[PDB]
Amino acid sequence: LEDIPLTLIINKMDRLILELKIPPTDAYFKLKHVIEEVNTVIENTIPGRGESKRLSPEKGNVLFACTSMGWCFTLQSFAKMYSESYGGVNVEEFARRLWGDVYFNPKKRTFTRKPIEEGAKRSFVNFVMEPIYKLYSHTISEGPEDLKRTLSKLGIFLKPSQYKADPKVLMKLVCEQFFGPSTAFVDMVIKHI
């Protein structure tokens, strides 16, 4: 009503992973439920102008964060970590194609709306949420040698004393070295505020 520009920060994703323990597709459904609830009350505040101030992850004004472990990312920043780890990926178009009812066919290497190859999951799920779930599960579920092997396979290096830490502090260190700092939040604020 005061027309201050508004951006969304979905918080406490560890509750999706560790409290609710819902599968990654249900995590996507929960995320979309929260985002549509926010946009629904935005639309009901002023009728007819809900499209002007739409909050949705593909625009870059929704930042998924877990503040206990201390990581935050947008879709653009997550595609940026893809572009850093592999190279030659258009971050803007990929972040556009990440969210929604977009399904990823790996054999055709394409984006559709129905599963063409009979088992293709969502683009957001397959590229974003299942890596986070696998990171969480393998960080709290593996011994220190297996953890060292896995995190070195991705490229994350820790001092050997830190591999034997408590699960919560080890989790914080692993997520800190994986996601990195809060640059995604800075980008979100600069672009949308």
Binding site: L18, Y86, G88, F94, R97
Partner: peptide, 25 residues
């Protein structure tokens, strides 16, 4: 739009749930 052949999800080969993950949570 297509992605390069190298691009995979980060933990592509690693399975979602270790047998100790129930015990871990």
């Amino acid at each position: 739009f297509v992605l390069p052949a190298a691009v995979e999800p980060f933990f592509a080969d690693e399975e979602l749930e270790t047998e100790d993950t129930r015990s871990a949570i």
